Each structure stands twice: as structure tokens, then as C-alpha cells.
Design a binder for this molecule. Structure first.
Ligand SMILES: Cc1[nH]nc2c1[C@](c1cc(-c3cccc(CC(=O)O)c3)cc(C(F)(F)F)c1)(C(C)C)C(C#N)=C(N)O2
Ligand SMILES: Cc1[nH]nc2c1[C@](c1cc(-c3cccc(CC(=O)O)c3)cc(C(F)(F)F)c1)(C(C)C)C(C#N)=C(N)O2
Ligand SMILES: Cc1ncc(COP(=O)(O)O)c(CNCC(=O)O)c1O
Ligand SMILES: Cc1ncc(COP(=O)(O)O)c(CNCC(=O)O)c1O
Ligand SMILES: [Cl-]
Lengths: 442, 442
């Protein structure tokens, strides 16, 4: 007593928009550091009938009948996750049920410190995530500044983590958790140094490696698993999985952490797991452990380096003057434009990026930079030689933005009046489209 | 630089388990009150490339480029949602970003009362959800008992909500929110009466209609939208959508509630929306508003009434002695067996149900009932006449359970040694498979 005609038939209205979306993705230079493109197999898992099953709890201990094959999927995903990050199931545990990065983080922090517990994270404007305790004088923007007592460490004026500031703050504030691993941080992290500050104050070491996970799995960047108590990561960014998350926990350093984290995910926060996600994660984690995926990840850093190098060669300034990873933050102060303007300009030419703060940004109403990254385009086969074009396209967009602002003014509503039908923008779009639309698309 | 082989080729291990899961779903009598089967259209949305897009924020106010077609999908889903529940966009608003029911509830409660705020919900044992403030003597089991101050009202010894007890509790405790609408409650709710109790003590009325949503839309059961300040619902149960949730809020009764709820969902709790979910939710919400779907939902209640009636005709006791909705709770005290034993027995014959408390239960270690429901089997085409067969199968399972406990003992670990290779169970399983396997399966 259901309707089984295809999407296109049942809902032509929705099917048009999705078809539109697919054309825009195919025809965009996607430079969002946190985006990627999933393969057909990951998307086959996400559409699988396994999302019909309620399976609250954990393997073998399910509050519903008929969970025998769901248990195998969930245990396979845990296995592959410990394999991907080169950890022993004797020493490390992983919860695979968290619905996304933000949920995973609030859950993991709750497990460690409880309500009113103290945490330390990097400030938003310095590259930290919302879920690392972010707040404003005006309000407690994240739940992690409200359900917990949070304190925020800033980076220095060059953009680097200042460990002397982290230690000083940890000694006076005495948090139970210090969060490192970030959202728009272009350098690697001295986890050992964090571990040393946490041992000093008897605080847990939380590493959120969502943005850099693939590097950690492939041994290209530092490994927080040598030093960290908890490691969270989303699966949808550089790792190239579905939208989901993983909480890793060190049983050897913290006996009984396993039950606290598992009880935090369920029944404290979540109800039913999303088994289509877990399937999809299982599938991508198998790809992650092959040497082919390591080649992809290597290519991501090779593209990021080149893209950084080409922008500097066109007199564009970068936070920390470079990158150790997949992402760059461009400082736009020398052109007297905002990242909010460059994002609209770039949207008009099919270039996807985001506005981003820089260390000198006092207020998020006008961020002075944009963040870009290479995972997505590296998935489409762009090589090092291809990065000069992207750098040229971004250079041209900055210049057009400067022209548009001169003509129409620094007010954002006014600036947008300048964009539609602009002949250079139409010309740049056409160039962007022709190159992007040519690339392999999963 | 990706692998585009199909799922079967890239990951044969995982593909087999999923083919196994599909076979088990096809050949199971699924009586889980919270489960259903999605059509191929909803599953096409869930596997769509729209899940590649980061779109943190709300339509038009997005922190990333390239969100033009995502904004249309997200505004289409909100529109279709308000249409489905027969509310005007001038008086009612809806957030469509919550990842699941538990998230929706914690977010909505936070919006209304904040950390340390006071809430009242129905106790777990009496049919309430975990997210309605559930705790026990030993621990704050749900975050809704810890981040909030919760108190729990019980149903009477017959299983019905005791409004007198809710009034008494509200006057002494003075909560800021009262939650009604439940997980294992077999009757309809007098929301007006709740609205009257909330106006007395200036509390918000929260209706969680996850289990009865299709009835509320189709106008078969009482409508909490006439009375409630907030309505939450999952989209994966009787409504038959993907795994997601909706928060509805009453703008007329509560000017400014829109911002509170939207900011609670993001950036307080969540990060990026899962756009494949929102597409999927959009698709099914269109079906929900059709006359075909009302027919389905009427059939759910016609099946549930008949199933109640046939079980009573075989001397099986039901909590409240019947049902006004899609679900029944069988009291197993007269047979001296537990619901945990009947769940295993039923799992051995491909009958999916869950163990469930009844009002006399003092421990969730030994629940005295099972909950069953008709949405799933109703989706497979089962009519009123077919409920006698389901009732026959359940009666036989209870009888076999009694026999096995007699032979092997009351101990749960001992009882399971009875189940494998049991000739009658093999006979019953075979009978279950034959009827289930033949039905229409989306
Ligand atoms: C949207 C989002 N989520 N997590 C983030 C962001 C980022 C972000 C968040 C915000 C943000 C989001 C919600 C609330 C607030 C507070 C406020 O509006 O004052 C800021 C703002 C910006 C920008 F550039 F507009 F200033 C950026 C970006 C990755 C998009 C961010 C930065 N910078 C960091 N560090 O992390
Ligand atoms: C799994 C789950 N989520 N929300 C529920 C449940 C239900 C449930 C939760 C629980 C439950 C879940 C987690 C933690 C606890 C506390 C404890 O184990 O002591 C109980 C137990 C049962 C049962 F029957 F085993 F006793 C049932 C069922 C729908 C499965 C439930 C009941 N009864 C109610 N009212 O609501
Ligand atoms: C370090 C980090 N942790 C957690 C999250 C949360 O992920 P969800 O969106 O799945 O909640 C993000 C999101 N990253 C935002 C961005 O870089 O675009 C992140 O960058
Ligand atoms: C009334 C109610 N509200 C919210 C939720 C939470 O939904 P998620 O599982 O999607 O978090 C449930 C789950 N229902 C459990 C059951 O009846 O089987 C529920 O029954
Ligand atoms: Cl999903």
C-alpha cells in the first residue's frame, strides 16, 4: 500500500532541483576545505534499506528484534575504523553511531567532564570550531560554552598556536579537557606539547581531526593517537565518507572510558543509530586503508602547496604564509575588501569557497579572509599544474571585486547590485564552467 | 582520482551482509511500532549527491558558496511540512535540520528553558521517551535529566495518563515545559487538558508526536497544534519518511520563538545540515498530504484495532485493554514469562518486536510486556483479516516460550539454549517466511 514509481515521476518538482544541483556541482571549482565528493558505492549504502531498522543500543545488546545483520555491519565499521587509523583494538575503542561532527564532540566532552565541567578550546576567529566552547560577550553561541564552562585560547598575530598562552591559561583555569585540532588552521599541531600541558594539569587530551583525518591515517602529518585520550573525526571531509562521525577512546590510558563514551552517545544523547550511515562509513574506511587512497591524500597536500605557492607568486598574502595541510586562509586586508564580498563574487563565477576570519579580525560581522582547500578538486583529478589556473581565477575574482566595490560602494547590499550580468564575471564563469565540467565527476 | 566500481565490486564483504539484511526484512513479520519501509523515491533522495554540500546556517544566510539549489530544497521541505500538518505559515514555523528525534527534542527543550531549566515528562516505564527527562535512582540516564531539572509523571495502574497527578506535580514543581506525546502509549491524548495545566503554571506545552504523526496530519486523532507551543516529530516511523526530525513552533502564542528554536538547532547544537535527508523529507511530505496516504493511515488503525481484538479473543491481556492508535502493549504476567524471552522467541521465528515495560514493572531488567504495531505490515498490504494470523503466530510464540522456560529454566542465558533447532519454531519460522516473503515490498 505504497507508491513505487521513480523520484522523477512521484516528485518531478524536487527532481528538477536535484538535477540542477548536480549540474552546478559538475560545473563548479569547489574550494570548500570541508567538502568532497563521495563515490557511487558510498551513495549506494546511504540509499540502502538498512535505514529501516531501529537498533538502539550496541552490538548483541539491542532493544529491538531482528538486528543480527545490523550487528555485523556495526562491528565491521568499528574494525575498519581502528584499522584505518593504525590502532590496536586492545588499546583503542571507537563509537561509530554519532550522527555528525558536532554531535560527536558534545557527546565526547560530556563523557569526560559532565554538565558544568570545564573545557579549553581554540577560539573561533583563530581557527577553532563552534563545538570547542565558542562564545561571545553577547551570548553563549555554542552549547559547549553553556552546558560546560569553556575558556578560549587565541593564536598569535601570525596565526600560529601559542603554546605559552595555552599553558598559562591551563594553569589558572584548570580545565578537565584541552581541545586541539581545528576547522581553519593551516598548520600541523604539536600534540606531544599538548600532552605535556595536559599531564601538568591532569586534563584529558581531546584531538578533533575532522579536517586532517586522511593525513593522520596515511602518516603524512603528526599522529594524535600517540598522545591523545580522545580523537573525534567526521567522515565527510578529506576522508571522503558519508556525513557522520567517529569518537575514538584510549582504554589503556583511561580504563572505563569505553562505557562513559558509549553511554554518552546512547542513551544520554542519541536514540536510534542511522545504519545507512554506518554502512556507508564501513565502505569508505576500506578504501581509506588502501595505498591508492594514500596517493589521493598525498596529491591533496601537493596541490595545497602549489596553490599556496602560486597565490604568493601573485602577491596574495596567506595566514602563516603557507600551509602544512589541505587548506589555506587568504588575508584580504591589502585589497581593502571583505571575504563576504569575495564569496559572492566567487559564487557568481562557480567558485565555491567560504568567508573566514584572520587573527586581526575583532568582530565576525566583517571577516577579512577566505578559506580554500584542495580535497574536492583533488578528487576530480586536478594536479599541481592545474593549481596555477585556480590561483589565476581567484586573482581575477579579487580584482573584479575591487572594481565592483569602487563602482558601487563598500556596503554589501550595494555590492551585490554590481554582480548580475557583469561582462567579466560572465566571461570568468564561462572559463570556470568549461574547465570544471570537463573533469571526472563521481 | 576515485574508485567508481559499484558496491558489489568495491566491497563484496559489506554487499553480502546488506543482501542478507534485505532478505531478512522481506521474510519478517515486522511488528516494531516505530519502524516502516521507505519507497525507492525516498531512498533515491538519501543517495543523492546533495549530501556533498556544506550549508551551515539557514536559507539565504549561508556560511558557504554554492548553496542556491540547496536553499530551494530546504524552503520546499518547510513549505511541504507546514502543508502536511494543516497549519498556516503565518502562525506556525518549522525547522527541518534536526538529525533525528532525540536531537530535535534536546534542541527544542534547550530553546524553551536553557541549561538547569525545569521540565516535566512521562516516565519511561509508563510509556514516555528517554528524551522526556528520563532518569533513575542511580543515574541521570538521559541528558534531558542532567542538563535540565526534570521530574517524571507516572500513568495509573491501568496504564492511562493521570491528569490529576500531572496537575498536582506541575503546581508543586513549577516546570517551564510539560512534555506529552509518547513512545509506548496506546491511547490518544487530551492536549486541551494539558494546555489548561500549562496555562495554570505558565509553562510551555511540548507535544512529541513522533509515534502518531500520520494520524495528526490525516485528522484521524486529536490535533496538538490547536493547543501546543512546540510540536516535534521524527519522519521515519508511521509518517514513513527518512530518519530525520521536525520541530514546529507557534509564532502567535510565542513571538520570537522562531529565532530561539533556529539558534538552538544551529549554531547551538548542530553544524552542517544533512541535505540528502531534507530532500528525502521533502519527497515524503508530499505523499503525506495526498488522499492515498490518508487511506494507508486509516488502514493502520483498522489493523491495530483488529489485532487488539484478535489477541483479546485468545485471552491475551493488553495495557488499557485496547488501543486508539497504531500500537498495542501486551501484558505477559499471566503466562509468567518476560518480554525479553518473547523477543528472542519471536526473533527465532522472524517476528520483529520489542520488549516493553508495563505499569506494574519496577525494573527494566525484567520487562513484563512487549510492544507491537501495525505501520510496517500495513505498508506491506496486510488487511484486517490478516491480523488473526499475526495474532495466531504471537499466541503460538507465547506458548512455545512457556514450554521452553518449563524445559530449560527461568534464567535468560539458559532459555536461549532452548531456541536453536527447535522443531516447532522451525515450523513456525517456515510459516512466517512463506506469508511475509510473498507480500509487496518497496
Ligand atoms: C560556519 C562555521 N562553523 N565552524 C566554523 C565556522 C567558520 C565561521 C563561523 C562563524 C560564526 C557562526 C555562528 C555564529 C557566529 C558568531 C557571530 O555571528 O558573531 C560566527 C562566522 C564566520 C565568518 F567568517 F563569517 F566570520 C566563520 C567558517 C569555517 C565558515 C569559522 C571561521 N572563521 C570557524 N573557525 O569554524
Ligand atoms: C529503547 C527505548 N527508547 N525510548 C524508549 C525505549 C523503550 C525501552 C527503553 C529501555 C531503557 C533504555 C536505556 C536505559 C534504560 C535504563 C535501564 O536500563 O535501567 C532503559 C528499556 C526498555 C525495556 F523494555 F527493556 F525495559 C524499553 C522501548 C520502546 C524499547 C521504552 C520502553 N518501555 C520506552 N518507554 O521508550
Ligand atoms: C574541526 C571540526 N569539528 C567538527 C565539525 C562539525 O561537523 P558537522 O558539520 O558534521 O557537525 C567541523 C565542521 N566544519 C565546518 C567547516 O570546516 O566547513 C569541524 O571543522
Ligand atoms: C516519542 C518519541 N520521540 C522521539 C524519539 C527519538 O527518535 P530517534 O530514535 O530518531 O532519536 C522516539 C524514538 N522511539 C523509540 C521507539 O519507539 O522505538 C520516540 O518514540
Ligand atoms: Cl543519511
Amino acid at each position: 500500500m505504497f507508491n513505487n514509481e521513480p523520484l522523477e515521476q512521484i516528485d518531478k518538482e524536487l527532481h528538477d532541483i536535484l538535477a540542477d544541483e548536480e549540474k552546478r556541482q559538475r560545473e563548479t571549482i569547489n574550494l570548500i576545505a570541508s567538502e568532497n565528493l563521495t563515490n557511487g558505492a558510498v551513495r549506494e549504502c546511504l540509499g540502502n534499506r538498512v535505514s529501516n531498522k531501529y537498533s538502539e543500543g550496541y552490538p548483541k545488546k539491542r532493544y529491538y528484534g531482528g538486528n543480527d545483520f545490523i550487528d555485523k555491519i556495526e562491528e565491521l565499521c568499528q574494525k575498519r575504523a581502528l584499522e584505518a587509523f593504525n590502532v590496536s583494538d586492545e588499546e583503542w575503542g571507537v563509537n561509530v553511531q554519532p550522527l555528525s561532527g558536532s554531535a560527536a564532540n558534545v557527546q565526547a566532552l560530556y563523557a569526560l567532564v559532565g554538565v558544568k565541567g570545564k573545557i579549553m578550546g581554540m577560539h573561533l576567529c583563530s581557527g577553532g570550531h563552534l563545538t570547542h566552547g565558542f562564545f561571545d560577550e553577547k551570548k553563549k553561541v555554542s552549547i559547549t560554552s553553556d552546558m560546560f564552562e569553556s575558556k578560549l585560547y587565541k593564536c598569535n598575530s601570525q596565526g600560529y598556536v601559542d603554546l605559552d598562552a595555552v599553558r598559562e591559561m591551563a594553569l589558572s583555569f584548570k580545565p578537565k579537557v584541552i581541545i586541539c585540532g581545528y576547522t581553519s588552521y593551516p598548520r600541523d599541531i604539536d600534540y606531544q606539547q599538548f600532552r605535556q600541558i595536559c599531564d601538568e594539569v591532569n586534563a584529558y587530551l581531546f584531538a578533533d581531526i575532522s579536517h586532517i583525518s586522511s593525513f593522520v591515517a596515511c602518516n603524512i602529518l603528526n599522529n594524535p593517537f600517540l598522545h591523545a585520550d580522545v580523537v573525534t573525526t567526521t567522515t565527510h571531509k578529506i576522508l571522503r565518507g558519508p556525513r557522520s562521525a567517529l569518537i575514538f577512546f584510549n582504554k589503556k590510558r583511561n580504563p572505563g572510558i569505553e562505557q562513559k563514551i558509549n553511554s554518552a552517545v546512547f542513551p544520554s544523547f542519541q536514540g536510534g543509530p542511522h545504519n545507512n550511515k554506518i554502512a556507508a562509513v564501513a565502505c569508505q574506511l576500506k578504501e581509506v586503508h588502501s595505498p591508492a587512497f594514500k596517493e589521493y591524500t598525498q596529491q591533496v597536500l601537493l596541490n595545497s602547496k602549489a596553490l599556496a605557492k602560486a597565490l604568493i607568486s601573485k602577491q596574495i598574502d596567506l595566514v602563516t604564509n603557507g600551509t602544512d595541510n589541505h587548506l589555506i586562509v587568504v588575508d584580504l586586508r591589502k585589497f581593502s575588501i571583505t571575504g563576504s564580498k569575495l564569496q559572492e563574487t566567487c559564487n557568481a563565477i562557480n567558485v565555491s569557497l567560504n568567508k573566514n576570519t584572520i587573527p586581526s579580525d575583532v568582530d565576525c560581522v566583517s571577516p577579512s579572509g577566505v578559506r580554500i582547500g584542495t580535497p574536492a578538486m583533488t578528487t576530480r583529478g586536478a594536479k599541481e599544474k592545474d593549481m596555477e589556473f585556480i590561483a589565476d581565477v581567484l586573482a581575477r575574482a579579487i580584482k573584479i571585486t575591487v572594481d565592483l566595490q569602487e563602482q558601487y560602494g563598500k556596503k554589501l547590499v550595494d555590492f551585490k547590485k554590481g554582480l548580475p550580468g557583469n561582462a567579466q564575471l560572465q566571461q570568468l564563469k564561462q572559463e570556470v564552467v568549461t574547465w570544471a565540467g570537463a573533469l571526472p565527476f563521481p
